[PDB]
Symmetry: D2
Subunit: 354 residues, 4 copies
C-alpha cells in the first residue's frame, strides 16, 4: 500500500434507538439511503425489513441519536450540500424526510453529541479545511452558520468527547500524518490550534474512550498493520508513543469497549476474513488476532445490544448485509456464524477523497 491510501470503510452506519434497538443505514443500488431495525433489542431478534428514504445521496450516511432519543441521519446530496433527516419521535418509524443544511461537502459527514445535548457535524469543506455546524439548542432543528476550523484534511474526520466534555477531532493531514484539534472548554466554540500526532496512517482514524477517561486512537499504518496511541494525562496534549500490532489488515478497524471494560478491535484481515483482537487485561497486552470463517467485502461495523452482547455487520460477497453476534453476555462467549439481513444489496457510497 501507499502512504496516501485510505482503507476500505464500513458499509453501514449503526445506531441504538432510545430503547436500544439497533438500526442500520446504508446506500443501495438506487443511490438512496435504506434502513432496517431490530424489532426488539436483542441480537437474535427479527428485523423489520428494508425501508427506503426517498432521495439520491452522494456519501455514506452518518447517524446519531439526539439527546431526546430521536435518531438523525446526515448525508451529502446531489448538490454536494449537507442534508439531514430525523425521527419525529423516539422509537418511532416516522421521519421528517431530507432537509437542507447547505454548505459544500467533500467528505463523509461525522456527527458528535456535545455534553450539553447539542449535535455538531464535522466535514471536509470545498477548500479541504475542516468545517462544522451545530444545533443552537439541544435536540432542536435550529442550526448555526457554517464555520471553518482550518487545516488540510486527507481523510474523513473522526470526533469524540473527552471525559470532561471537550470535543476532539482527528483527521489525516496533507503530510499523511494524524492531526487533531480540540475544544478548550466543554461544548463551547473555543478551539485549539491543529497539532500533529506524527505517524503516517492509511485509514480513517477510529477513536474510543477507555474507562479511566482517556481517549485511544486506532488506525492502519504505512505497513498495513494496526497501530494505536493513547492519552496519558488529563488533557489533549499528553500522548503515548505509537504502538503497532503484528498482522496485516485490509480495512479500517472498528473498536468497541466490552462489558468488562476492555477494548476489542475488529478488522478485515490479510486473508479477507473478519479478524478480532482484544486486551487480555486492564490496559493489558493484546491477544493474537482470531479469525472468523467467511470472506467479507467491507470493514466491520460493530455495535452493542441492550444486554451488552457485541454484534458485527459486514458486506458479503453477494453484496448483501450479513451479521454475527456473541451468544452470551461474556467476554469469552462463543459467536454465531454469519446470517443474512436480506432484501436489498448495498454499495459503498463513501466520498472518494482524492
Amino acid at each position: 500500500i501507499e502512504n496516501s491510501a485510505i482503507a476500505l470503510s464500513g458499509i453501514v452506519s449503526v445506531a441504538n434507538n432510545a430503547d436500544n434497538r439497533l438500526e442500520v443505514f446504508g446506500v443501495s443500488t438506487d443511490s438512496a439511503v435504506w434502513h432496517n431495525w431490530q424489532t426488539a433489542p436483542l441480537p437474535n431478534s427479527s428485523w423489520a425489513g428494508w425501508n427506503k428514504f426517498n432521495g439520491v445521496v452522494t456519501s455514506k450516511p452518518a447517524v446519531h441519536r439526539n439527546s431526546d432519543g430521536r435518531l438523525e441521519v446526515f448525508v451529502r446530496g446531489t448538490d454536494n450540500a449537507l442534508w439531514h433527516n430525523w425521527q419525529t419521535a423516539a422509537d418511532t418509524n416516522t421521519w421528517s424526510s431530507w432537509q437542507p443544511l447547505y454548505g459544500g461537502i467533500t467528505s463523509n459527514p461525522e456527527v458528535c453529541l456535545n455534553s450539553d445535548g447539542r449535535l455538531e457535524v464535522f466535514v471536509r469543506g470545498s477548500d479541504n479545511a475542516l468545517w462544522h455546524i451545530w444545533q443552537t439548542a439541544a435536540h432542536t432543528n435550529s442550526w448555526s452558520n457554517w464555520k471553518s476550523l482550518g487545516g488540510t484534511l486527507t481523510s474523513n474526520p473522526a470526533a469524540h468527547l473527552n471525559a470532561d466534555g471537550r470535543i476532539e477531532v482527528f483527521a489525516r493531514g496533507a503530510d499523511n500524518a494524524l492531526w487533531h484539534i480540540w475544544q478548550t472548554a466543554a461544548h463551547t466554540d473555543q478551539w485549539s490550534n491543529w497539532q500533529s500526532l506524527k505517524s503516517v496512517i492509511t485509514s480513517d482514524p477510529v477513536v474510543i474512550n477507555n474507562c479511566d477517561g482517556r481517549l485511544e486512537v486506532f488506525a492502519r499504518g504505512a505497513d498495513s498493520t494496526l497501530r494505536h496511541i493513547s492519552q496519558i494525562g488529563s488533557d489533549s496534549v499528553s500522548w503515548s508513543n505509537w504502538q503497532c500490532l503484528d498482522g496485516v489488515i485490509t480495512s479500517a478497524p472498528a473498536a468497541v469497549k466490552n462489558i468488562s471494560g476492555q477494548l476489542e478491535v475488529f478488522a478485515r484481515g490479510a486473508d479477507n476474513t473478519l479478524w478480532r483482537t482484544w486486551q487480555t487485561s486492564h490496559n493489558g497486552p493484546w491477544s493474537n488476532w482470531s479469525s472468523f470463517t467467511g470472506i467479507i467485502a467491507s470493514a466491520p461495523t460493530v455495535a452493542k445490544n441492550s444486554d451488552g452482547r457485541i454484534e458485527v455487520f459486514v458486506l458479503g460477497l453477494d453484496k448483501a448485509l450479513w451479521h454475527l453476534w456473541q451468544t452470551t453476555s461474556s467476554t469469552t462467549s462463543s459467536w454465531t456464524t454469519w446470517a443474512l439481513i436480506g432484501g436489498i444489496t448495498l454499495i459503498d457510497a463513501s466520498v472518494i477523497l482524492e
Copy 2:
C-alpha cells in the same frame, strides 16, 4: 447506634435533564414537592428559582430521566399510593401534574431505567415485601399491574443495572442484614430468589458500577463506619468479603465515579461536617477522609455536571439547600465553599420505616 437504625438520608433527589442541566426535587414546609434547575449545565450557573408542584406528598420524591429525555418524578401521596408527574417534553418546564399508579406504599420509591428504555419502580408494600411496577413500552405512560417479589424489607430499596442489563435490587432484611435479588435475564420479568450478603447495615444501601462492570455496594455498618462489598465475577452471586473504612459517619453515604474512573464517597462525618474519601488508584486503597468546613443537617446528594465536575447538595442549619462544587474538571481540583440555593426551606419527608 442500634442495629436497626437507618442513617439520615439526603434532602433532595437530583437528576440531569436531557441537556445535562441539574434539577433538584425536595419537599417544603407545605408538604408539596418543589423543584429548581440550573439555567445552563455548569456548576457556576444561575438557578431558575423554586417552583411548586401542587399536591401534598408523604415521601421523599424519586426522579429519573426517561429514555426520551423527559424527567419523571415518583412520590407517595396522602392516600399512601404511588403518584407520578413528568415533563411533557425534554428540557421543558411544562409538567403533567400528579397522576395515580395506585398500590399501597410503605417506603420511599426507587426508580430504575431498564436497558430497553422502560422505567421500573420498586417499593416496600403494605405487607413489607418488595413490589414493583413497570412501563410496558419505553418512555410511555402505560404501566403494568403491581407484582410482588416477596421478602421482608427494613430499609428502602436500591436498584442498579448490571453491565449485562439485569436489574439488581438491594435492601435490608428482617435480620438487619443486606439482601439482594436480581433479574436472571436483562429487562425481563424473571427473577432470582432472595439471597443474603450477610453483614448488618444501618443505612439504606448505595450502589454504583465500576468501569470494569462490577457493582459495588456501600452502606453504614453496625459500628457506624462505612463498609463496602463488590462483585468479583461476571454474575450476581460472586462477591468479595466486606471491608470497612475507619471513621464514624453520621449519615447515609453517597458515591460517584469521577472522570478518571475512580470511586469517591461523601458522607456526613462524626463532627457533622461533609467528609470525602476517594480511591487513590484503580481499585486502589482509600484515602483518609477529608473534611469540608460547615455543619450540615442531611446526608449529601452528589451529581456530575456536563463538564464532569462534581457538585454536592446538603441541608443547612438554616433548613435551606446549599451546594459546593469542584473548580476544575480534575480529580485533584480545589472546591468552592457552600453557597445557598435560596427561596424555600426543606423538610425530610422520608417514610419512617418502623
Copy 3:
C-alpha cells in the same frame, strides 16, 4: 478482647537456605532451640529430623539469611541479653554455637537485612525504647555498639525494607496505636522521628511489600478483625486510610505475596481453624475467608518453596509441628491436608511483654 492484648504468635521462625530449602527454628520443652530442614527444596521433600542447639533461651528465635547465604539465628538468653548463632558456610549444617551480643532485651528480636548486605537487629530495651545493633561489614561477625531509637513499645517490632532501601520499623506504642520510624537514607544511621499511624492494634504488626514497591501493614484490630493500611506515595509519610475485613481472627496474621503478585493472608479464625484470604485482582478486593480442616494452636507461619508453592506451619493440639502446602504452583491450586513434622514438641517462648 482488650485494647492491650497481643494475639497469639507463630510457633516457629522459618527461613530459606541459600539453595531455598526451608529450615524451621522453634523452642522445645527443654527451653533449647531446635531446628529441622527440608532435604530438597520442594514441599513434598523429606525432612532431616530435629537437631538441638545447646543452650537455654528465653525468647522466640529470629532467623535471617546473610547476604552470603549463611543462616543466622538471634535469641534472648538466660541473662536477658542477645545471643546469636550462624551457619559456618552456606547450605551446611555446621553452626558456630551461641555467641554474645550483650544488651538488655525485653521483646523478641527482629532482624532485617539492609540493602548493603548488613544485618540489623531491632529489640525493645530495658527502658521500653527501641534499640538496634548492626553488622559493620556485610555478612561479617563484626557488630556496632547498641544504640537507642527512643519511643515506648508495647509490641514486638517489625522491620521491612522500602523499595529504595530504607529500613522502616513498626511497633505498637503506649497508646496501643501503631507507630513507625524509618531510615531517611538507605542503609544509613539517619532516622526519622516516631510517627503515629493512629489506629488501635491487638497483635504485632506484619509488614509486606507489594510489587509496585509500597509497603502494606496488617494487624488485628480492637474488634478482633484483620485490618490493613498501605503506603500510597513514594515516601514513608503518605498512607491510606485503615480498612478492616469482616471475620474474627484469633491469632496474629501472616502475609505472603503469591507468584502472581497478589497478596494472601493467613490467620487462625474464630473457630480455631486456619483461615485464608487473598486479593482477587491487582490491589483488588479481598476474598471471603476460606477455612482448612483442623484445629490449630498457634498463628500460622508461611513460607514459599523454590517452585513458588506456599507452605504453612502451625502448632497442633498435640503440641507438635504440622504443615500443609499447595499441590501446584498456581494461585487456584488445591492444598494438602496437615502432615506432621514429628520428633519434638514445642513451646511458645515469646517474651511476655507486660
Copy 4:
C-alpha cells in the same frame, strides 16, 4: 537492515556483589578480561580502578552471582572452550583464575541461576545447537557433563526464570524468528520441545519479568524498531501478540524494572544517542522515547544500585567506559551527564555468529 542482522551489543557485563556494589567486566585491547567495581553501593561512589585477569579470551564475558554471594565469570577461551573464574569469598577481590569447563563454543555464554541455587550455562555449540552444563550442587565447583537441547541458533541465547522456577531460554532460529524452550519442572533436566514465537528479530532477545510474574521479551524487529511480547497465562505456551513501538533503534535494547514496578527500556537511538522509554502506568502505554545528550558506541548495559537508582554504562567514542545515573530514587528523577570510568579502553569481543 537485513533480517539476519544482529544489533550492536553492550560493551560490559555487570553484576551486583553480595553487598550490592556494582562490578563491571569487559575486554581490553590486550584481549584480556578486566574488571572494576564501586567501593560503596551508591552510584556516586568512587570506583576501585581497572584490574586485569590474566588470560586471552575470545568472547564477551558473562557474569552471575552464586547463591552464596560469590561472583563467577564465564568466557570463551583461545581453544574455543568454556572457561570460568570466581571470587573465592563474597565481596572479596581474590579470584580463582581461569579454570576449564571444555566443550566447543560458538556464541557468547549465557548464565542463569536455578531456584535451587545451581548455576546453569547456555551456549551455542559447534553444531549450532543449544548446549548446557550446570552445577551439580549449589554454589559448588562441581559441574555436569555437557548436554544438547537441540535446535539451530542464529543469535546468542537469553535465559530467565519463570515465577515458578522453570528456566526458559530464548534464541533466534534458522528462519530468523524468535524460538524458545523451557524446563517443564523447576530446576530439573526435563525440557519442552522448541516452539516458535513467529516474528523476525534482528537483535539478541532480552527477557525480564514483570511483577505479576509473567515474562516479557524485547527485541529489535525487521524494521529496526523495538518490539515486545508477553506471557498472558500461567505457563510458557500462552503469549500475547507482538507489539512494536515507533522509533528506529541502532543497538540491542536493555530492560529494567524500576522501583515502582514499571518497565523501562534503553537503547541506542537512530541518532546514535541513548534513548529511554518507560511504561506510564501498570502494564500501561509506553512513553515517547526520550534522548540523552552524547553519542554512544555500544548498546547500553543497565543496572540498579542498592537504593534503587538506575545506572547505565556505554562505550564512548573514545573507546572508554562511561556511565550516568538517576539523581534520586524516583521514577521521575533527573539524570546525571556522562562520566568517565577511565583507565583502559575496551573492545567488543562478542562472538561473530555467522
